[PDB]
Design a protein around this ligand. Structure first.
Ligand code: RIS
Ligand code: RIS
Ligand code: IPE
Ligand code: IPE
Ligand code: MG
Ligand code: MG
Ligand code: MG
Ligand code: MG
Ligand code: MG
Ligand code: MG
Lengths: 338, 338
């Protein structure tokens, strides 16, 4: 059922590429756009895009789910996937990453390099091309434009906080606090990965009320915090065959949930070990940090946190889901918790 | 009068920064946004922003130029300056440039580096923040949003053509044609630098007709082609004390107007000299190309072209300006021709 939902969503990508790549003077640039789309918008789990499609189906009366409305829903889900693609192509450059979704990062491909900066911006531009082509006559068109623009700004402010807290070649242990961590992840991840897909489906379903969006946001931003904590845990302890990418948080001096938890539990001797080995390229220094995390039983702390987080998000669904179907939030929680 | 217009426009920047930098959790990111704005949106000529302000004043009845409408006009002119800033910060990374507006490029500043990618995207995001804060209740709000989004897409397609025609470490003389050149510059420069500022003032003045915008575009895209040809000429023959930047077109293997003109005039012996020396970092190779350009009297070809271009644009103003005041176009031509 879930594998079928994913296959159904991916089968719409060929039409998305077709409409985006249809004077002959820009032909060569349009061929490059097609290559950028095929490399960077495919290969992920499609959690955000599928959330738009399933939430729309659960929020709109089936008699109103005609062929054109369903096409608009699939198209807006692909818009969120294009936003994800834009963020990841640029993030991989700024984080000096090597692989993404089981292949070399686009910018690391021979012949691409920093031209990937413009390619990332083309992916973002395609969102607004698709919204104009399919949604311009709809009453929610401006709501969707402003929602995507706001989500991009919030993510970029979060990325600024992430990069400021992680200066290259400078110790920043003093700034690795739970308060700083929560702000980084709320802005860099929670808004675009959890609030945006549900909010887009809500606007398409005619649910535009400030209070209903605020209540959904209460659940979704908390889900988003867990998703980034899980991402931080997997950066170091995930299987690369499963995650599809190589971790860089320790080398990049990141304010990861792991280092925040390490600092809260470390003895003065362990603090000194972290200070001397964190945020540096040397593989033996990275191994020393991982050994410290294992000595402090951080994988067990993460598993206990996942349990407590799940119970907290479920309690927030009980408080704030109404009048929306709880299934809207439960289905998204299922995608991130196991 | 013109120096006074520039000073009046720059005096509004402090309020632009104030409104964009006003929870305390993102405080550190907002301080970085202020630094990005002060470094990258100031120091230029403000030709695009001033065009919005002067064209609005010339297109709107003075009785309708109340304090709030004039504020909206200044704000939209600063939005075009933020779009310029976004494009330049990223272009300087992709072109491996050293200086911009008389100072080191933002990405070359110690401590910035490739974090400049996210900084560039923050500048673009501020456009939509300003349009929502000052223009959301106006009838032209959606027209302006779509105009800025379209101008960004066109510029990015042009940047793709520019970078595809200029592969690093590969000879691309065969693709340096007048037809390829005209397409690159129409998309990368002409739309955002000439059509966007006038079109924004037209929409704010209530001039939204397809035919009127098409007629203005006929003049403006041709002006834009000359502006990029002049930029290409100055890359090599301009005084850096005046241009504020160091040229990189020869080292970067760019489809510059100069190399297009060189190829049209070169003997087979000169073609071989260009083939062996173009698109390479070696200063002696760059000097060989410049000497070839001087041997082919390319500065004289440029001066004759500037004369013929000016007469052509003036003939297009005579054909297509009506019903707009010709002063709208003449004032912009004055900014680029001497
Ligand atoms: O996929 P990644 O690189 O682990 C990541 O989650 C990517 C990302 C990019 C933009 C916003 N949020 C997450 P990061 O935050 O760099 O750890
Ligand atoms: O200022 P520059 O770098 O000479 C330039 O004009 C900058 C630019 C950036 C984006 C679009 N158009 C021009 P380029 O095209 O790279 O020669
Ligand atoms: C915000 C985060 C954690 C970045 C990765 O998101 P995903 O794990 O959803 O990545 P893909 O499925 O799109 O590859
Ligand atoms: C599109 C071009 C030619 C890039 C530079 O524009 P300007 O010459 O207007 O640059 P600033 O005044 O903003 O520095
Ligand atoms: Mg990353
Ligand atoms: Mg990152
Ligand atoms: Mg990560
Ligand atoms: Mg450049
Ligand atoms: Mg360039
Ligand atoms: Mg140039």
């Amino acid at each position: 059922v879930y594998a079928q939902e994913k296959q159904d969503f991916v089968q719409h990508f060929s039409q998305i590429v077709r409409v985006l790549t249809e004077h002959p003077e820009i032909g060569d640039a349009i061929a490059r756009l097609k290559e950028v789309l095929e490399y960077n918008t495919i290969g992920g789990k499609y959690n955000r895009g599928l959330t738009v499609v399933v939430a729309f189906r659960e929020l709109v009366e089936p008699r109103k789910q005609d062929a054109d409305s369903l096409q608009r829903a699939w198209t807006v889900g692909w818009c969120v996937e294009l936003l994800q693609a834009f963020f990841l192509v640029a993030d991989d450059i700024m984080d000096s990453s090597l692989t993404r979704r089981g292949q070399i990062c686009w910018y690391q491909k021979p012949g691409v390099g920093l031209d990937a900066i413009n390619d990332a911006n083309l992916l973002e531009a395609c969102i607004y091309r698709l919204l104009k082509l399919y949604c311009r006559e709809q009453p929610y068109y401006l709501n969707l434009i402003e929602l995507f623009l706001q989500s991009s700004y919030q993510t970029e402010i979060g990325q600024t906080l992430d990069l400021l807290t992680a200066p290259q070649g400078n110790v920043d242990l003093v700034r690795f606090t739970e308060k700083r961590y929560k702000s980084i992840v709320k802005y860099k991840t929670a808004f675009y990965s959890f609030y945006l897909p549900i909010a887009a489906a809500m606007y398409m379903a005619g649910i535009d009320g400030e209070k209903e969006h605020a209540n959904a946001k209460k659940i979704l931003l908390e889900m988003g915090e867990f998703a980034q904590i899980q991402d931080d845990y997997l950066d170091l302890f995930g299987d690369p065959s499963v995650t599809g990418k190589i971790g860089t948080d320790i080398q990049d001096n990141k304010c990861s949930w792991l280092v925040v938890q390490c600092l809260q539990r470390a003895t003065p001797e362990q603090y000194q070990i972290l200070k001397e080995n964190y945020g540096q390229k040397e593989a033996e220094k990275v191994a020393r940090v991982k050994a410290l995390y294992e000595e402090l039983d951080l994988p067990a702390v993460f598993l206990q946190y996942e349990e407590d987080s799940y119970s907290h998000i479920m309690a927030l669904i009980e408080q704030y889901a109404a009048p929306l179907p709880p299934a809207v939030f439960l289905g998204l929680a299922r995608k991130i918790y196991k």
